[PDB]
Design a protein around this ligand. Structure first.
Ligand SMILES: *[C@@H]1O[C@H](CO)[C@@H](O[C@@H]2O[C@H](CO)[C@@H](O)[C@H](O)[C@H]2NC(C)=O)[C@H](O)[C@H]1NC(C)=O
Ligand SMILES: *[C@@H]1O[C@H](CO)[C@@H](O)[C@H](O)[C@H]1NC(C)=O
Ligand SMILES: *[C@@H]1O[C@H](CO)[C@@H](O)[C@H](O)[C@H]1NC(C)=O
Ligand SMILES: *[C@@H]1O[C@H](CO)[C@@H](O)[C@H](O)[C@H]1NC(C)=O
Ligand SMILES: *[C@@H]1O[C@H](CO)[C@@H](O)[C@H](O)[C@H]1NC(C)=O
Ligand SMILES: *[C@@H]1O[C@H](CO)[C@@H](O)[C@H](O)[C@H]1NC(C)=O
Ligand SMILES: *[C@@H]1O[C@H](CO)[C@@H](O)[C@H](O)[C@H]1NC(C)=O
Lengths: 596, 248, 50
């Protein structure tokens, strides 16, 4: 006759019903990404519609349970996630603009076009067409043409569509008793119902802003060094007194600077650590890629992979007619079914991606004993950061020399480690200010305290401050260039990448201290340490059943979001950068001084 | 049959070979509780009632004496100090089908805990709250019966493991059925010990001209001295005589 | 639990009384031998009372 015993009855009924329907939808989605046919698109839409309609019925039934008397926290977190109304608050005339708009955007984004107007020779898709012209060529004129080949042909038809999207989805939050739609995404970090352990939604903004004043002095010296090793290819085209152009920072958006390593190598005289030519002489197969990965995990202490993965997944590119996309994604089909979806290649990146995507699988089965609603990460940043700490360890020269891929006599001087470490600095430190600023821009358009005529004047004023680019020609309000990026268009929370770095290095220092490694963090290793397994495994089994703020106290002992154990990784790089920048003007404001 | 409709058939008046199961090299949870595999061979126990049901792989360990959980509490409760063994083996290649095998159901919700050795087959629906349910689905009816989904690609834990349970107990009923005792080779004309079906002794074998009726087992001649046996294995007569002995 | 007094749980054979049985050997019930690695049939006899 109590509500507490009635909720446990409903969640026991929902757990068995949902895991049967979720497996059917996940299996249909798995077959779409391996065997593309005309009927398979309809097969995926059939299962996905009945899964979304199943949550509509369960959300209405859980609404009548009052939340003011459930002292248990395991079922309180389950009822908070299940009672999210979502689209049920909206009317029938308003719910039909969701499935229509979201499917038109995905099909429009899948159309690859780089054919120049009035000269229709040919143009390929994104993977064969766009990546070779951005990663290999060193011509200023055509890359400037390529910037207007995408920002003037796809984003022009989004200006009446995206502005209608951001004024009515924000109103749903007040109908769901939230503050704004930006506050809705902060509910994953929200903890309530525990006295003295509560984490406010607004505390994440204060803690994130306090940690940004030590990222900046590391990034000032990184940008100053890279502008001197970039002017070799462009002698009279960029001045070494200001900032860098936007279309020369590796990607279209400048998120990853991986393509600048060849241009800005510190010491290219000695040969790099490359064994790609060595494995093809001895015929290394893809069976061997997963066999050494399996014995790596069982030596640490983690359980090995199940028998329902090797005979079920695909490894090479099969057949000739199967044109299915193999974008790197992690699959959690449920009911003990775990798969890896990738196209294998004998390259540097695919071998590391093979290590990166397996770590999410080992995290997924860890909370397999948890109920279905709690069968997830502690937040959106845990499940991504766990899969990247093993990528840092596998790329170390000590681990490469441990297996025997590298030569037994390979000296480790100063320059053999700074070249490797600066590649990691360009892909980790350089993406932190870009990730936080874009989500900060998304926060103001979602809060609604930005008028129609003030979209561009706030977006452009941080590009002048952070990136440092003066507009070569004035541009009006008809452009809709901020909505062109892949994550913002496909409804992905981008704050999970800012918190990914601060989590993947808090755990790295904690496990290295557990293994009692004598040396710096770049040479540290995780393998051959059963002491490190208990540190990871105690926090993996929690899932969403415990608050994420208790997971920090389980590893570092500090309840807040610490930024100190990130500068200690780059102390060897920062002290060299301080000596290299003895005479250069480090730290730019907005600067029209030299060429006013 | 399913766990909620487990059958109970009596095994008696027959011979059971427990040695073949030991060397099957196919079982996964061949465990014996309260009894050793060796001690059940020489001596047996009557009341060999067998229970058959389907148990999910991850919850196989729940079915054991003194072990509580979900299946052991509402579907099949074992009595304390259960003198028996549990044998389980995989059935992935036959007890599964594409699209989900929605044929195995189980009882998830019960108002009261199940007492040992009681089968509850009923269509009554659960009562989570206080409002009665008159057969119309509502917010607190929660139809108990649920169907498992056994796809061929499911994980090891969710695979339906084929498990059976054997119960050994002693009631006042006499005349139990026991496991067979290995035989030996034959020896002729030697003062050798023997243990026939009921009687044992020592002596030498010799031919005899007389014949006995076919419905006897042994016999005695004078003063309760056993002097005749006939093994039914070969349907040939061998007669026993005491071997030489005396005082030196 | 006073986990300081232990005892022998199984032994393969019966020994002569008034004889000390001080050994860390593991029981062998199944046909698969155990070589110091605990398994499904090693049955480490030693246990501590609570
Ligand atoms: C981590 O443990 C493994 C397993 O012992 C070590 O691999 C051994 O390395 C030595 C010397 O390199 C070889 O002689 C052995 O043959 C290796 N073992 C096997 C099974 O091949 C590995 O070296 C250890 N890691 C480090 C950094 O020492
Ligand atoms: C794979 O796709 C082809 C056509 O693209 C189709 O003929 C074939 O039946 C598919 N096979 C499977 C196993 O889906
Ligand atoms: C609520 O019940 C769960 C069930 O296991 C238990 O783990 C949890 O500690 C309980 N909460 C409180 C506050 O007692
Ligand atoms: C969800 O919808 C129901 C029915 O319209 C309503 O009673 C409830 O208050 C809503 N809850 C939220 C959080 O919007
Ligand atoms: C996986 O681990 C289990 C338990 O350690 C072990 O029994 C099994 O042999 C392992 N699998 C392989 C392929 O080695
Ligand atoms: C690295 O630099 C320091 C400082 O100049 C120098 O003393 C040291 O010898 C260098 N390392 C090697 C291997 O020469
Ligand atoms: C049982 O007796 C019969 C006699 O007809 C014999 O043929 C058979 O071999 C005997 N059983 C065994 C196992 O030898």
């Amino acid at each position: 006759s109590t509500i507490e015993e009635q909720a446990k009855t409903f969640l026991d009924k929902f757990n068995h019903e949902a895991e049967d329907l979720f497996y059917q939808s996940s299996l249909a989605s798995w077959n779409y990404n391996t065997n593309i046919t005309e009927e398979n698109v309809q097969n995926m839409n059939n299962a996905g519609d009945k899964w979304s309609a199943f949550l509509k019925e369960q959300s209405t039934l859980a609404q009548m349970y009052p939340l003011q008397e459930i002292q248990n926290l395991t079922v309180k977190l389950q009822l908070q996630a299940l009672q999210q109304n979502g689209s049920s608050v909206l009317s029938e005339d308003k719910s039909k603009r969701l499935n229509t708009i979201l499917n038109t955007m995905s099909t429009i984004y899948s159309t690859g076009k780089v054919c120049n107007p009035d000269n229709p020779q040919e143009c390929l898709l994104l993977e064969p067409g766009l990546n070779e012209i951005m990663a290999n060529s060193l011509d200023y004129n055509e890359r400037l043409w390529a910037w207007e080949s995408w920002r003037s042909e796809v984003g022009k038809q989004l200006r009446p569509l995206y502005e209608e999207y951001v004024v009515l989805k924000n109103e749903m939050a007040r109908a769901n008793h939230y503050e704004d739609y930006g506050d809705y995404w902060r509910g994953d970090y929200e903890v309530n119902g525990v006295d003295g352990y509560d984490y406010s939604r607004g505390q994440l903004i204060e803690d994130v802003e306090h940690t940004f004043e030590e990222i900046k002095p590391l990034y000032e010296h990184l940008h100053a060094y890279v502008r001197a090793k970039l002017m070799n290819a462009y002698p009279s085209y960029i001045s070494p007194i200001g900032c860098l152009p936007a279309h020369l920072l590796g990607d279209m958006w400048g998120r990853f600077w991986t393509n600048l390593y060849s241009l800005t190598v510190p010491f290219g005289q000695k040969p790099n650590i490359d064994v790609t030519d060595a494995m093809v002489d001895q015929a290394w197969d893809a069976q061997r890629i997963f066999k050494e990965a399996e014995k790596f995990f069982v030596s640490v202490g983690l359980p090995n992979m199940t028998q329902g993965f090797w005979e079920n997944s695909m490894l090479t590119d099969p057949g000739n007619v199967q044109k299915a996309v193999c974008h790197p994604t992690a699959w959690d089909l449920g009911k003990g079914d775990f798969r890896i979806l990738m196209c294998t290649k004998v390259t540097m990146d695919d071998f590391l991606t093979a290590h990166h995507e397996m770590g999410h699988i080992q995290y997924d089965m860890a909370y397999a004993a948890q109920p279905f609603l709690l069968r997830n990460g502690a937040n959106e940043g845990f499940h991504e950061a766990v899969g990247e700490i093993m990528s840092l360890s596998a790329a170390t020269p000590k681990h490469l020399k441990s297996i025997g891929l590298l030569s037994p006599d390979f000296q480790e001087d100063n320059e053999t480690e700074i070249n490797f470490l600066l590649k990691q600095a360009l892909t980790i430190v350089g993406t932190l200010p870009f990730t936080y600023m874009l989500e900060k821009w998304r926060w103001m358009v979602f809060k609604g305290e930005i008028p129609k005529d003030q979209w561009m004047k706030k977006w452009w004023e941080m590009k002048r401050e952070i990136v440092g680019v003066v507009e070569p020609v004035p541009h009006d309000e008809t452009y809709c260039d901020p909505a062109s990026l892949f994550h913002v268009s496909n409804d992905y929370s981008f704050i999970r990448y800012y918190t990914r770095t601060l989590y993947q290095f808090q755990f790295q220092e904690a496990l290295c201290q557990a293994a009692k490694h004598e040396g710096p963090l770049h040479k540290c290793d995780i393998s051959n340490s059963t002491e490190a397994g208990q540190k990871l495994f105690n926090m993996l089994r929690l899932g969403k059943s415990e608050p994420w703020t208790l997971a920090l106290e389980n590893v570092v002992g500090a309840k807040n979001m610490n930024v100190r154990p990130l500068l200690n990784y780059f102390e060897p790089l920062f002290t060299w950068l301080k000596d290299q920048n003895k005479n250069s003007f480090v730290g730019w404001s907005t600067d029209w001084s030299p060429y006013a | 049959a399913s766990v909620y409709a487990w059958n109970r058939k009596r095994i008696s008046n027959c011979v059971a070979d427990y040695s073949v199961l030991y060397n099957s090299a196919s079982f996964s949870t061949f465990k014996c509780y309260g009894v050793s595999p060796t001690k059940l061979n020489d001596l047996c126990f009557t009341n060999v009632y067998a229970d058959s049901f389907v148990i999910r792989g991850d919850e196989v360990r729940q079915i054991a004496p003194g072990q509580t959980g979900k299946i052991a509490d509402y579907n099949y409760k074992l009595p304390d100090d259960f003198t028996g063994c549990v044998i389980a083996w995989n059935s992935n290649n036959l007890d599964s089908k594409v699209g989900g095998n929605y044929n195995y159901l189980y009882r998830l919700f019960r108002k009261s805990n199940l007492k040992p050795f009681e089968r509850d087959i009923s269509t009554e629906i659960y009562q989570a709250g206080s409002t009665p349910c008159n057969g119309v689905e509502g917010f607190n009816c929660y139809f108990p019966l649920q169907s498992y989904g056994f796809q061929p690609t499911n994980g090891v834990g969710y695979q339906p493991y084929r498990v059976v349970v054997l119960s050994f107990e002693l009631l006042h009923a006499p005349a139990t059925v026991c496991g067979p005792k290995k035989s030996t080779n034959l020896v002729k004309n030697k003062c050798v010990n023997f243990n026939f079906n009921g009687l044992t002794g020592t002596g030498v074998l010799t031919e005899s001209n007389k014949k006995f009726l076919p419905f006897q087992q042994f016999g005695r001649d004078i003063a309760d001295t056993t002097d005749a046996v006939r093994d039914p294995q070969t349907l040939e007569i061998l007669d026993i005589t005491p071997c030489s002995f005396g005082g030196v």
